[PDB]
């Protein structure tokens with residue numbers, strides 16, 4: 187039926203309805219530190235989030251998205267391996283049922299407890315809908331989450347979850363500052379890929395930060411109390427909403443640091 191992360195409609199089944207699943211530039215992939223090419227020409231990243239306007243938070247089955255007003259250049263991504271301005275539209279997480287799993291990308295086969303995806307679209311295309319038809323339409327800033335000390339900036343997201351427990355719920359989520367979710371350093375790995383959920387369109391330039399952010403056990407625990415199901419249906423806990431790594435094929439992972 188509609189895809190999911192279940193035994194019967196999971197990642198291994200995705201190819202039946204989305205043929206692109208066995209494509210050439212699918213994501214996520216495993217980051218092998220000893221094979222990534224140090225590309226000195228890669229420019230530094232430019233993250234401008236001071237005029238960011240968060241609007242809503244919703245549980246769409248699969249995961250929960252915090253949406254941003256992208257009608258103007260309020261929160262943008264420039265620099266690095268990118269050419270042109272990219273507007274932040276939404277961010278979401280992928281997590282597991284246990285701390286030792288949850289991330290989509292792995293570093294040398296190592297899984298993190300979760301992974302934050304900050305989704306941006308290429309402004310030259312006009313709207314996100316057009317962006318997804320171009321090979322360089324999207325830019326997703328990936329940030330790993332490891333369990334340790336609590337991340338203050340993540341607390342606002344954690345407290346509102348009780349109100350979007352099931353599929354289809356949403357709640358006003360204004361004045362959220364995404365800068366509170368960035369680590370100290372902006373060192374990154376970059377490679378050409380795709381969305382990690384159906385439609386699995388190969389329209390993404392991936393930028394994975396080297397430094398992970400740390401969150402408390404109680405913070406990620408509250409993520410795990412969300413539901414895949416809508417109100418009134420049997421309860422199915424929202425966990426392990428991650429796609430396993432894919433073959434790199436004819437692709438090069440470039441590092442911005444030595």
Ligand SMILES: NS(=O)(=O)c1ccc(C(=O)NCc2cc(F)ccc2F)cc1
Pocket residue numbers: 303305318326380381382383384385386387
């Ligand atoms: N985990 S990830 O960063 O790769 C990712 C980011 C965004 C989306 C998304 O916006 N879905 C909607 C959507 C995307 C399309 F490409 C076409 C239609 C559509 F509704 C999906 C996956």
Ligand SMILES: [Hg+2]
Pocket residue numbers: 317318319320321322323387388389
């Ligand atoms: Hg595309």
Ligand SMILES: [Zn+2]
Pocket residue numbers: 278279280303382
């Ligand atoms: Zn994602």
